[PDB]
Design a protein around this ligand. Structure first.
Ligand SMILES: *[C@@H]1O[C@H](CO[C@@H]2O[C@@H](C)[C@@H](O)[C@@H](O)[C@@H]2O)[C@@H](O)[C@H](O)[C@H]1NC(C)=O
Ligand code: OBI
Ligand code: OBI
Ligand code: NAG
Ligand code: NAG
Lengths: 533, 535
């Protein structure tokens, strides 16, 4: 019995496991209940705090993954399976994990809270790419990660109802955040320096905590990687959640109370089986059950909230990877695949646009096409393929990111922006996909430091740099290395200068304007074009 | 006769002519100036198509330029060379249907390629007698036969009541065509080859050139064409029949005037009266719009230039087309608040948006907003230098560059051999401010060989470059190909194709080949903007 692996939290005692990191040991406290299991009559309901327990609770192993869809497009291919559930699926899934240095820190240590993505339909804090041991051992960080309910279980809403109020998967997150405030000092964490970080849906979730007042007393800084609360995919209107929830109910054979009661009688896979049948159009980068603009957790649309918000004493780090949209093309757009170069025709490019921008009228999709076509090389298959990925990435990530960055900067936040441009040497997806969505995470988490993983020594050095920016950001709100001099410095992003930096194997480079001309199309013109059909 | 110079006496279908021996830098040229080609379109012949000139008796003196067609005289900058160089330089009269011929001296041994110039001036102005159109250098240096004609402009040339007998419209184009017929019948008398005739013109003249290409009865009268900073397609070069009728009946109201009655009353009006009100009839506050222009009548133009270029067959034709570096700057100072020749014209963002409404007067609010969003630099959305240069570009692109690119593509796709250029050299003698770059019209003195006149103050480099451009223009006239046949060491000028979209820089440096004439931006104007009009 190691005194270092025993912790008394408010609910009772816990026993961790000493793990081996390349540099030395870390303590991990995995599978901690932070809520009552949301099972039975608690399906679709806000989480309740976990009742205290007798004895010493075994926190040496990851808990179950929230009930979700398992990917089937490329069975047994690492590039897809690396995101698939790596534990048993259960609705009993509300647990969090804590890594700390060993011995546990002498003084209060900045806390990093990770919120996974997965389109609000998938994910788990147990995936190898979210391994907290490196950040804990190398940087001295206390690292936290929670499971939150995904899919229908997290986001099925009948707005204004008592029994499916919507946004419960975000309340799961808020609860883990509260758990950290109350409990993290016992692990050596500083609850007075908490930084949220997340990628994709995790980043939009982080963005919703910025925009929801009750969340604001539970963190100090935020990192949003490749996702935003604003934009076309991260929320739905109250009317449209109602539509999709009552559609799913028809599909499984089911007065709000009557309807919800019947949905609660349904086996979990029954919900998942029909989860994708409720989207209004054939689309990609669009998810059925997502946070709803309820007038509660979200008092207005994210767009409204970022336009009028006051972000006085907030610091934010945001960025994108080089090829945000490539990954999504293989899952819906005819002519695209990982098993070849995916060289498309003009006709397939026009069809792909109607799927990547499903909300577009004829005129608006034509404006997209006429903008993304290279008029010197209009029928060139390589250009057309790359433009298709660009449409998807710009519309869904880069331009929302640029819109958020600018509003936050203008409204008194401190913002730092990046583009991640290094393609993992170990990447299993083909070259044409470039640096796809999700593929910065392994570097930020420090995975190249594990020698058995086969990364180059250059990528190990680059990981160490990224871990430093991210933890310097957590410590100080400024990602710059206070010991390093000539770097060059990473400047804050502003609406005037519009400076962001390239994260790649070369030293930092400062660039201005994150797709400025193209994003003006998406953020300024396109709305005016749709709102007159 | 018997005392006169034997080489200056020539007979044409209408009678005997006496010309003048002119001095060009390299030696003498023959010039036959103010040859009447029509009956004076005066009195009851106002607004009427031209009738061929009736034969005269005795020897007609063809030693001085004739009257300039009745027109507006520019007043923005009185005394300023930059504007005055374009103003009438002979008496204004409705009796103006005369043409000019320059040939080598003595006249050429064997039949010589004929170049026919058609002046610009928005269809409301121009004269073939302006200094910048002087044919003496092309004649002397290239051995060229050069013809230029006066045609009617403004209400006199283009006021139409489409369908009427008394004002059918397009008669200014009919003057041009009559002069092309005069060349077929009579140019052999001067050593000119009627089986090798090349039209060239700039701005409205280039539009004119383009309309002879699109008009069947003109096709038998010329063989090759040069369109310089102008096209028959685009937003300014024609109006619909309904719009012409509307403009004609307003002008009529303004001067106090059944179509016969209306026109009979216009014919009783002093020329100056019509001129005094012609600008008063445009539908919006605008620049690069002209009141009285070719009308889509279903006769001279059987359909819109757009319909005809898209569906035409241009098999047996070679075309040279191009643009200057700064097509729009000139137009700004006549109508966009915040722009002047006398300062740097740095404008605010508000002055930009207002200017876009004036430069694109046919645009809805959505369309104007598209233009503003496309041309804004979103790194520096409020920078006054960028906004100034963006404003110029909007106007240049909308009216010239994108119409030209549209034309070149259609023509090339449909049988014609096409060669394309951008003219990027700014005269060392230009009187317009630096900000205006290389304005509309400021290539013409180079094609015409003016720098060769040592009394004009061009650089030696400019003399050499002028000589180069005259070689290209005349090689094109000769052979439908601007490239020197012998000289293979010079860099070549490839044809423009839809596939490769190749064009050349014209500056003091050897030809450089570039690809795509504003391809991204002209997709906005040519492909997207029309569709946003339909909403
Ligand atoms: C540049 O010029 C524009 C036109 O104003 C005219 O020319 C100048 C020299 C004035 O002094 C005035 O006499 C004329 O009406 C102006 O609208 C514009 O403000 C000027 N730009 C600046 C900032 O000087
Ligand atoms: O019940 N869920 C059904 C379902 C959910 C999602 N999809 C499509 O999701 C596949 N997908 C995986 C990863 C990605 C991008 N990852 O970065 C995009 C799309 C199909 C069916
Ligand atoms: O009767 N005519 C009246 C009238 C005509 C034209 N305008 C304005 O046009 C003057 N202008 C001259 C040259 C140019 C461009 N030249 O390249 C643009 C505008 C005012 C009144
Ligand atoms: C790649 O594969 C898909 C389907 O398996 C196919 O539609 C496409 O034509 C292929 N791409 C290329 C390079 O032709
Ligand atoms: C050109 O230069 C001469 C000689 O210096 C000068 O006197 C004359 O006025 C100039 N002429 C023109 C055409 O401007």
């Amino acid at each position: 019995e190691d005194p270092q692996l025993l912790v008394r939290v408010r609910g009772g005692q816990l026993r961790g496991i000493r793990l081996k990191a390349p540099g030395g040991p870390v303590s991990a406290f995995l599978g901690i209940p932070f809520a009552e299991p949301p099972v039975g009559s608690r399906r679709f309901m806000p989480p309740e705090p976990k009742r205290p327990w007798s004895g010493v609770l075994d926190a040496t192993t990851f808990q179950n993954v929230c009930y979700q869809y398992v990917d089937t497009l490329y069975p047994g291919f690492e590039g897809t399976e690396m995101w698939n559930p790596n534990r048993e699926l259960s609705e009993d899934c509300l647990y969090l994990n804590v890594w700390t240095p060993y011995p546990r820190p002498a003084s209060p240590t900045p806390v990093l809270i990770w919120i996974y993505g997965g389109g609000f339909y998938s994910g788990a804090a147990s995936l190898d790419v979210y391994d907290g041991r490196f950040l804990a051992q190398v940087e001295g960080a206390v690292l936290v990660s929670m499971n939150y309910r995904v899919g229908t279980f997290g986001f099925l809403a009948l707005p204004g109802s008592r029994e499916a109020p919507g946004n419960v998967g975000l309340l799961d997150q808020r609860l883990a955040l509260q758990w950290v405030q109350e409990n993290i000092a016992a692990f050596g964490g500083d609850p007075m320096s908490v930084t949220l970080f997340g990628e994709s849906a995790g980043a939009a979730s982080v963005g919703m905590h910025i925009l929801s007042l009750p969340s604001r007393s539970l963190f100090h800084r935020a990192v949003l990687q490749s996702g935003t609360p604003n934009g076309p995919w991260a929320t739905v209107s109250a009317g449209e959640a109602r539509r999709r929830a009552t559609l799913l109910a028809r599909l499984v054979g089911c007065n709000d109370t009557e309807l919800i009661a019947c949905l609660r009688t349904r086996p979990a896979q029954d919900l998942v089986d029909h989860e994708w049948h409720v989207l209004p159009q054939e689309s990609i980068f669009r998810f059925s059950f997502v946070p709803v603009v309820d007038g509660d957790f979200l008092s207005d649309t994210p767009e409204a909230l970022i336009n009028t918000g006051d972000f006085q004493d907030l610091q934010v780090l945001v960025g994108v990877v080089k090829d945000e949209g490539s990954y999504f093309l293989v899952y819906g757009v005819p002519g695209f695949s990982k098993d070849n170069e995916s060289l498309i025709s003009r006709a397939q490019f026009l069809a792909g646009v109607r799927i990547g921008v499903p909300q577009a009228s004829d005129l608006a999709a034509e404006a997209v096409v006429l903008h993304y076509t290279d008029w010197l090389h209009p029928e060139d298959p390589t250009h057309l393929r790359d433009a298709m990925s660009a449409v998807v990435g710009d519309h869904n990530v880069v331009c929302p990111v640029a819109q958020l960055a600018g509003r936050l900067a203008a409204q008194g936040a401190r913002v730092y922006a990046y583009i991640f441009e290094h393609r993992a040497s170990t990447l299993t997806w083909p070259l044409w996909m470039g640096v796809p969505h999700g593929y910065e995470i392994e570097f930020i988490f420090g995975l190249p430091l594990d020698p058995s993983l086969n990364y180059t020594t250059e990528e190990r050095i680059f990981a160490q740099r990224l871990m430093k920016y991210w933890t310097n950001f957590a410590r100080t709100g400024d990602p710059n290395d206070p010991r390093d001099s000539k770097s060059p410095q990473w400047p804050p992003y502003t609406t005037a200068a519009q400076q962001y930096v390239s994260l790649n194997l070369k030293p930092l480079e400062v660039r201005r304007g994150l797709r400025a001309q193209t994003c003006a199309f998406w953020n300024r013109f396109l709305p005016k074009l749709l709102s007159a059909t």
